[PDB]
Structure 1
Amino acid sequence: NYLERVVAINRVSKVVKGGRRFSFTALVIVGDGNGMVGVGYGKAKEVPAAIAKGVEEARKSFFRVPLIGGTITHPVQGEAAAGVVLLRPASPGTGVIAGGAARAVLECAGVHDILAKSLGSDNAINVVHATVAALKLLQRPEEVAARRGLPIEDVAPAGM
């Protein structure tokens, strides 16, 4: 009962003595669609083994995302090795606006209102890494309240 989507599929080549060797790497994003998201690179000779390894790695690397009612709390600006993607909270009426990789990761996480744009490299893996990094630097208002004190210096009009 998980939601999975593949982001990029490509074939690699390595030169051997007698000829050519091929292999398949397929990044797969897995989640339950509410708050859980997983990232798996994966690599094998065949595409089924590759996406199976990607799914397994995503299950292993599942990580928690902070939500405030279907949207993120405050705008964030992550950066991968080369990917640069920023995320901003949006009105509940607005859907999810993002590219391929970013939208796949966000929809596996379970975000319904988000504004995402890519400003760095256009590589799918780096875009995914930048998006998940931004999700990591995303924090919780309750956590920052624990950090400072007096959990009143925050705005949560939606609440719930």
Structure 2
Amino acid sequence: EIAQRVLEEWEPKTKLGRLVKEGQITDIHEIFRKGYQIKEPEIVDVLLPEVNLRENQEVLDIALTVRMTDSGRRIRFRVLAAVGNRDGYVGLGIGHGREVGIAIRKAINYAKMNIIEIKRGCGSWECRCRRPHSIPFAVEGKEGSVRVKLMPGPRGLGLVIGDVGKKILTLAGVQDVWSQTLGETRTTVNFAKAVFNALYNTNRVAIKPEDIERYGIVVGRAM
């Protein structure tokens, strides 16, 4: 139903969209580690239909801003939103507008266009299971003055981190994690971006084939 609807009620404008429509690309993982550019949210609407449910479209922050003139004040609205599948895919976006609906739509579209793969595992001294319920090793991220460090934890220990990190990690599919932070966390944008970059940095660590089995590393979706 939705598959054919979204696939035949849309005409692409890029070669990636053309490939995805004609059917040379079928799985979400074939678009990432080649240096492609993504300019169409329909690509992700097709290769990942889970990012269209309202259960997976958390809005993270709304802010009001001002521009002064010789007449008066012109108001603007900034919206920070996140989208994701709960099995290894997450994206973050910002949108500016004069009304909240415009802002939210633009933010969700930018979030769709900015999506990343992450790795998952156990990693902890205290669980040593091979189930991908957490991250496999400790990682660091930064944006602005905010410095985030994520550490793996055991099962049943749920997301010891602020609310924005809770939401982003829940949408990425992580269930248990410890955290340490520095800087001004009361900036939602930079806190969220630092968590996002910490998650992205799971792919910048060099591993050996043994570690994969030792930690139950999963790239993207599982089973």
Q: TM-score range by the shorter chain?
A: 0.7 to 0.9
Point out the structure with the larger strand share.
1
Alignment match of 1:117 (pick from 157, 164, 180): 180
Aligned counterparts of 1:18 and 1:42: Cα–Cα separation in 2: 26
Hey, what does 1:72 align to over in structure 2? 135
Number of residue-to-residue matches in the alignment:
154
Q: What SS does the aligned partner of 2:96 have?
A: coil
Corresponding position of 1:92:
155
Structure with the larger RCO, 1 or 2 (CA within 8 Å, 6+ apart): 1
Provide the C-alpha distance between the structure 2 equivalents of 1:38 and 1:159, rounded to a whole number of angstroms. Answer: 21
Identity %: 27
TM-score (norm 1): 0.86
Match of 2:171 in 1: 108
Give the structure with the higher percent helix.
2
Q: Secondary structure at the match of 1:57?
A: helix
- Aligned equivalent of 2:193, options 123, 129, 138: 129
- Are 1:24 and 2:24 matched, yes or no? no
Contact 1:99 1:117 in 2 (8 A): no
The question of whether the paired residues in 1 share the 8 Å contact of 2:136 and 2:217 is answered with no
- Relative to 1, partners in 2 of residues 1:153 and 1:5: Cα closer, same or farther, differing over 3 Å? closer
List structure 1 segments (4+ residues) > 3 angstroms apart after TM superposition. 157-160
Structure 2 portions without partners, runs of 5+: 1-49, 122-131, 219-223
- Root-mean-square deviation (CA), in Å? 2.1
Larger Rg: 2
Please give the alpha-carbon distance, in whole angstroms, between the structure 1 residues aligned to 2:211 and 2:136: 14
SS in 1 for 2:154: coil
Instruction: Give, in angstroms, the shift of residue 137 of structure 1.
Output: 1.4
